[PDB]
């Protein structure tokens, strides 16, 4: 199962 | 044995040809088990191994939501990286990310990983401490600052030590007849004259899983690293892998050469020779 990211995970 | 899970993301811009493609694939060891492709007619997470099919709709929906969200986020990230490198809007660029967890033979967490690249060059990586970052350049330092500000590392650590290991263990149990089965290489040595006084000895390994294998030639018990042609381990298409190692030897000297095979599937390492 993959990790859930957020919008602040943006580079 | 030891086992790992990895997700591999590729986000690729293509100016003039629509928005950046996002594709994610998931692996346990050398077995792919899911894919998501934003260019698919109807993008959704799809199973790619029989043992994942038993997961319920909630699983597929969750995965698809995550990947759809990433499809958007990674497009913004591509825009951001373009700016960090003062690049023109004309060129295609690629963010790649690989992450996941490694288990030791006891099923315990060995270590976690989260690494990113931009246009094929290392960009930023989570350190083994799962707490700090290594940034490759002053652009990646901008990402690092952003990720430090947003405590991204803490969230990756939670995943890597938690969900990652938990799911990997589940997959290993569900797919135990394959994922926890090492198939040893089937081996033979072939002989092909290359001239009157040289011949090729090719040591073959076929039908093995997982892909990790060591295939070497020795002459009089000495490794022949420089004189050995070694092809990249290659997938057969039936889950197994193939590899060969070849040496060109003086005619008549064939019996001085031994092929040595190490594979998880082998309790005992093989020593093979040409058998005329």
């Amino acid at each position: 199962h993959p990790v859930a990211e957020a919008d602040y995970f943006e580079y | 044995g030891s086992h790992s899970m990895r997700y591999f993301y590729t986000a690729m811009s293509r100016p003039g040809r629509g928005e950046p493609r996002f594709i994610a694939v998931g692996y346990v060891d050398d077995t792919q088990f899911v894919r998501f492709d934003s260019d698919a007619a109807s993008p959704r997470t799809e199973p790619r191994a029989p043992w994942i099919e038993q997961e319920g709709p909630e699983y597929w929906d969750r995965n698809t939501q995550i990947f759809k969200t990433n499809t958007q986020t990674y497009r913004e990230s591509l825009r951001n990286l373009r700016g960090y490198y003062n690049q023109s809007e004309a060129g295609s660029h690629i963010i790649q990310r690989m992450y996941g967890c490694d288990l030791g033979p006891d099923g315990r967490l060995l270590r976690g990983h989260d690494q990113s690249a931009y246009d094929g060059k290392d960009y930023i990586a989570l350190n083994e401490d799962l707490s700090s970052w290594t940034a490759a350049d002053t652009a990646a330092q901008i990402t690092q600052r952003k990720w430090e500000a947003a405590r991204v590392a803490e969230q990756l650590r939670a995943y890597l030590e938690g969900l990652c290991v938990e799911w990997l263990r589940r997959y290993l149990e569900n797919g135990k007849e394959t994922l926890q089965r090492a198939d040893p290489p089937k081996t033979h040595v072939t002989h092909h004259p290359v001239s009157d006084h040289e011949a090729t000895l090719r040591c073959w390994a076929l039908g093995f899983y997982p892909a990790e294998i060591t295939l070497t030639w020795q002459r009089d018990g000495e490794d022949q690293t420089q004189d050995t042609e070694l092809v990249e381990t290659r997938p057969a298409g039936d889950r197994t892998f193939q590899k060969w190692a070849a040496v060109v030897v003086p005619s008549g000297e064939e019996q001085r050469y031994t092929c040595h095979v190490q594979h998880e599937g082998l309790p005992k390492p093989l020593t093979l020779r040409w058998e005329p």
Binding site: - | S92, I94, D119, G120, H192, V231, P235, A236, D238
Partner: protein, 99 residues
């Protein structure tokens, strides 16, 4: 910035004439990811060729397996034809059952 593909052409099972098998072309070690791969039978493009999902190695280079069912014979020639941004023209690698 760019890495040219490695190419291997080979069969899934040991080749036996008149026995159905799979013809593989494995392209690997390339960057960026766009790549064109055709399997050829006596020089002509085979139509129904499938491929694996895009993934990459630890060094970030991409790899793909292209494959199709085939029945090798003594006289039919097979090959894999690859183009990539790094190649000025398509590269053809012939199927050699000893490779």
């Amino acid at each position: 910035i760019q890495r040219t593909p490695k190419i291997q052409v080979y069969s899934r099972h040991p080749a036996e004439n008149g026995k159905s098998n799979f013809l593989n072309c494995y392209v690997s070690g390339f960057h960026p990811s766009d790549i064109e791969v055709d399997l050829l039978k006596n020089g002509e493009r085979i139509e129904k060729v499938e491929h694996s999902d895009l993934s990459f190695s630890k060094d970030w280079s991409f790899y793909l397996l292209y494959y199709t069912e085939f029945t090798p014979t003594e006289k039919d020639e097979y090959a894999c034809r690859v183009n990539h941004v790094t190649l000025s023209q398509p590269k053809i690698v012939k199927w050699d059952r000893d490779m």
